[PDB]
Amino acid sequence: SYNYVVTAQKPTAVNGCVTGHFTSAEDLNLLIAKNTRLEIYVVTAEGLRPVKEVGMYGKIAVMELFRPKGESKDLLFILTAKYNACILEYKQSGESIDIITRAHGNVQDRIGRPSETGIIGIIDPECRMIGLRLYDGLFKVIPLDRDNKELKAFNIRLEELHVIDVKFLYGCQAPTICFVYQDPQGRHVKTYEVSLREKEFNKGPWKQENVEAEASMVIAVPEPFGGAIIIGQESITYHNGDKYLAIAPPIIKQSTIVCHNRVDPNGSRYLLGDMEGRLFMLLLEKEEQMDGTVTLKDLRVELLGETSIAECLTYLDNGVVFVGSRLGDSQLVKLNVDSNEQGSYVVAMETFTNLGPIVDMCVVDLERQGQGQLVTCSGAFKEGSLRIIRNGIGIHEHASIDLPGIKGLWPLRSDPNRETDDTLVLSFVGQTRVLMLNGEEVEETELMGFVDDQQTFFCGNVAHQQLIQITSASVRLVSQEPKALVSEWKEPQAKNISVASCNSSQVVVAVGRALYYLQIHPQELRQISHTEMEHEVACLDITPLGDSNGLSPLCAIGLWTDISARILKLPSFELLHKEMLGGEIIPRSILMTTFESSHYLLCALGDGALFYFGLNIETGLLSDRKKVTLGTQPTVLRTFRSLSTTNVFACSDRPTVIYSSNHKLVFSNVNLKEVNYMCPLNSDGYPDSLALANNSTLTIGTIDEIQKLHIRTVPLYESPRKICYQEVSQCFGVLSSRIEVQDTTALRPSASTQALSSSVSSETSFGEEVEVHNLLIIDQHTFEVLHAHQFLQNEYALSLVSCKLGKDPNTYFIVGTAMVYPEEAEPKQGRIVVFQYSDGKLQTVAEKEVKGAVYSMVEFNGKLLASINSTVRLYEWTTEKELRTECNHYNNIMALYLKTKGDFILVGDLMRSVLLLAYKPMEGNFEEIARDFNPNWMSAVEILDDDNFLGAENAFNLFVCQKDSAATTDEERQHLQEVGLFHLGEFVNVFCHGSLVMQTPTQGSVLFGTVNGMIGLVTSLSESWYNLLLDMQNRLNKVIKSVGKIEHSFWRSFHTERKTEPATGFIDGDLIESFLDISRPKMQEVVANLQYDMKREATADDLIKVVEELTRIH
Amino acid sequence: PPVKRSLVYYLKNREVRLQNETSYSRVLHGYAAQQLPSLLKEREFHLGTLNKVFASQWLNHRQVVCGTKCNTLFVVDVQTSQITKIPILKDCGIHAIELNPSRTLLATGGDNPNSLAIYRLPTLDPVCVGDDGHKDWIFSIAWISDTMAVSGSRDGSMGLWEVTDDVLTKSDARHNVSRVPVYAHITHKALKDINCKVRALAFNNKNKELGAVSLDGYFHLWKAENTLSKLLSTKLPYCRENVCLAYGSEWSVYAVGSQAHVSFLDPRQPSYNVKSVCSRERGSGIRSVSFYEHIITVGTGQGSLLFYDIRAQRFLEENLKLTTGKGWLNHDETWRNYFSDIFPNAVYTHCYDSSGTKLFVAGGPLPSGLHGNYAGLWS
Amino acid sequence: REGEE
């Protein structure tokens, strides 16, 4: 098998940020590390001007800043999670910016083992040496120097195995180190002093104390005080050898401080802040003495306020505090000197979106347009939300009117003092309507100067402080004041007009076959030029482009009998080019538009086929002919201004925006059910917006960003686990849990209590914390909790399915639950419950009392496949509407996952790899076809096709194992081989069959959602493609560079604690795509001497157009 | 508070990364350990005509080394079914194989069943000769530190030997100045003497003791903090055929075998807390024993592995019991004389995996006059 | 018969 993996959306969660003068000597920088992703911001008086972002070949694990002596700006130390120490700097020459590496080198000890509180990385304050605690029992040390290019370490055998935290004390002659460790006697603190010449730990300044039981997180106060602050759970302590101060605030005993930051550069004030989002402030009371000694007086803490569940704080200046979160969003709150509401010196200022952890996901198509939106679960504990991701272009619904049967929509400005909109003009067959816009408000009316009994074809604001509108029998040019018909032109032949348009000084109408051009003069229309066209005209466009003040002499048309488009030059209407589109149905709309100063024309037919051409207005000539198909009904190609960019819309039954991306025109099916006509809008409440007349209504809204994905946070205020879907009921089932403190009473108004309707299904010491579970039927239009159901007490719920069973025509919801207790290793109880949601009120059908913990369900061809603890089971849905057991299957340590495809089943196990089954229908029992004999710890399975299988191991790796049909005996036809090994980098939670793009090298699409909020896509390939792309790969890894000089093949290699071998049969979509965004002279090195097809050697532009076909997949 | 103990908390926290931590690394295994016994399946290996497998030790996830009665030393791959034969070291074949705690040296017998040998893992190059400290056999080779080893013997000598830093250096230098095997002798830093034969050993790794066993039925504990210093002795509970003994590094009990019993011994505690679980498989003799988290794997002569639970005091599951295959046999003259009227391959050795999933059994036939290999990998 | 040490 030959696969392909690429990421749809880069990580979002934040696991470490730092700050300081990286980019220059005075520019206070902020630096955030997402997962393998580093981001450098400048800090300004109002925001965070982003400066750079780079990608590491490794999961950042430790990031620090330090300024050595003799260096103006700072240096940055980075340690990946495969032990790649590197030391970075920051160059800058005009716009040429890059991140040089001054030192690099792996520091993994040949044979050790990992640590029980992860890596730790610290630096002395005098910039002499880095200290790392990778493995237990030892303490690796990298002496800073100039002659240490290769980071060259050396261990020091600590006699303490279970270290818990460590820091480099302040104000000390030779490097000292203070740390807290555990021991059979408790938890202690101790200081050693490293000797960089004898390479050993001399006894250090003060003594081993005896510290609170569950301490952690020591701090190193700066110069004027010195010493250390230890923050346990129920107390805070100051140690300096002689002195000792202990304060036990009553508040902080509620949750556990996990981060901190030094606000003042001399230790006065400290930021803290615990699990559940809160934020404190730690104060150091100075008691300076007579002889000059500055000492301490006392310690006190006070609660600032609330914010997201924070994971790495930061203080910049002026009261601006960066909060960085991993279980939710990351704010930018600001600090006040005085409380307002109930006491809060913190009020938000901004927010950055964060998808992780993606605990589930389910791809659906809500309009049956077959495009793809991607509802997911996210966050935790007070930040659990549902996101709704979707490719395309955004159209919010800020308002809507009941206006069906619409034929035309435009903007108009009734006040000649308003450069913004206050008029939305409507057409209907045989009449014309107007819409007064007061701010965000829209109200039906008639704008005098406009006909009430004849149909109109265009209107706009033009030169000479007036508007225009072309009617069925006339051109009505109307001054903006007092909005009365000031000029009117007519057709000589007294024929009813059918199609028309106008601009600042020019008008073009088409009646019958004759095309008339009309001149705009002060409240006057003058007849100059007009021609007689061979065939009937459908479309006519004089939209001026770019930077001109409403003048363009080109007119594009399309024909009714000779199906094609044409271009013309005003005033003479002289035919400049005739371009045959094709298709089956007549063209209806044509449009010209600016695109990065490039003129682009698009002519659409009635069958949904649109032909788009580059324009030369100097020659009116058409070029770069290409085609697209969108739908089946007529289309409307209208220009828009928004996001400082002007582009085209094709209004169809699957409407789309045609906009630009890197000088290449990208299409996107826009978030609209079905639209008939459009009017872009610039009201004082609708800046750069649009009103969209559909089959029944006119939806007024404003665009999202035209960028590719668009999230939609639906807060829930508890933690969601599972999601499902039921199209015959037009809803979603979701499972959720909220952490209701036992005494039991909850803590927030949550979406499971704020329920429209509700129901409840039918060791006890206080101060505990139990979790309570609910089934919420989220709606699907207004995403509101139509119902919530409560399970028994203690009863977790692990599994959900919505499915049709057996000989019954009803779809149901089915759950699998487990009576979890706190002192039991294996759940010896469980249930599987099937209920249905009718008449808006959800009711219980039946239940089945299992004897295990149902970690999975699927619907196996009208039957129920239920994975209970260690045994798969298969169930049949009988006619008395009960479940009756059909066939068991033992032989599993812990069955945890399930898939099916036809008559095959792919179990995945806690600690052994995947296991194939099959259902022999002749006798009705399970035949274990094969299995895999490596001990992998699984997280997610998938049936890539009928033979390959795909799995994800919790050491962050991907593997593809296939049924070796090339076997002979019945011993090697019971092993699964291993064709694919990859080091992903992330801990996948869920696979799903789908794709977020409008419907071939690739022959599939699976999506997977990680814990760092990534979204990635895996698709098979063909052996010729694979062997081309892999050679291209190994050629890429010779010209491209790496931040930190890490080696691609080193990173991707299947890595675990025991084995380690290169990657087999995958392709790095990211690297391949980054082939594009480089310089052509460096694209000349890679291309030479390839295996293009037959065997031959392609060229640069071939490799260009051979991977664009790989972006259209994601 | 009560212990946060349930697999579901680990399962659901793992999904968020929030506190999936290593306070669970001991329940996952306490669970897998009682799960495996019920779902193992043989997979025979074809050695050929070698005599009987006596020693076996895992080297990797895939290569396990075995030593036979014909003093062969061979590495078998468990994937490709590939036997590779290696040299032997000069100065009733191999009887015990061990790896230093750092998995860098390998301390087994040599061409002389009374001398020793030292190979440098993971490349197997020969390093030392066997020393003279034993004129009788070597029946056990325990490792006490990264460079000190203690060797039992069939005479009674308990000679501490120790690979020196100097031979380490001129061994990482002797394979550079040459590529032909070059050896180097060592002197037994001690030769402490003691039905007076040092058959089987153990090693506690905190008190740094070496509670051995002597087939007459006498436990002999000799602490080795850095050098040997005999501590105590005791007549063991059962007398006949005490040939196997191991120590559960986290239960403070020695499991020692006998003719038809298995005894749990606390050394610093007297002889009134001695529990001898009966195997009832009368006629085999417990030829091996080993500790998984709380589960004792007993490997007997009639060809069957048995499982006991130190915590629930009873056997797993009618008690679950595997059974070794047929393997191979020789039809020599003594096969005709006294052993033709009838083999239950006796498991002399068995070892789990670093990943704790795949077990490896080996052995041969129980009557001493016979000649036949067997080795099988049970996952 | 036996005698396997």
Author numbering:
A (entry chain A): 2 to 744, 749 to 767, 779 to 1015, 1022 to 1115, 1120 to 1140
B (entry chain B): 40 to 130, 141 to 243, 252 to 374, 390 to 414, 417 to 453
C (entry chain C): 310 to 314
What text does the study give?
Damaged DNA-binding protein-1 (DDB1)- and CUL4-associated factor 12 (DCAF12) is part of the CUL4 E3 ligase complex, which utilizes DDB1 as the adaptor protein linking Cullin4 to the substrate recognition module.
Interestingly, although the MAGEA3 protein was co-expressed and co-purified as a 212-amino acid construct, only the last five C-terminal residues (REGEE) were observed in our cryo-EM map, suggesting that MAGEA3 interacts with DCAF12 solely through its C-terminal disordered degron end. A closer look into the DCAF12–MAGEA3 interaction site reveals that the C-terminal Glu313 and Glu314 residues of MAGEA3 are anchored to the DCAF12 central pocket, while the N-terminal portion extends toward a small loop (residues 438–447) positioned above the central pocket. The central pocket of DCAF12 has two distinct patches of positively charged residues that play a crucial role in substrate recognition and binding. The binding of MAGEA3 Glu314 to DCAF12 is further stabilized by salt bridges with Arg203 and His144 residues. Our cryo-EM structure also highlights the conserved binding mode between DCAF12 and DDB1, with the N-terminal region of DCAF12 making interactions with DDB1-BPC and the WDR domain of DCAF12 interacting with DDB1-BPA and DDB1-BPC.
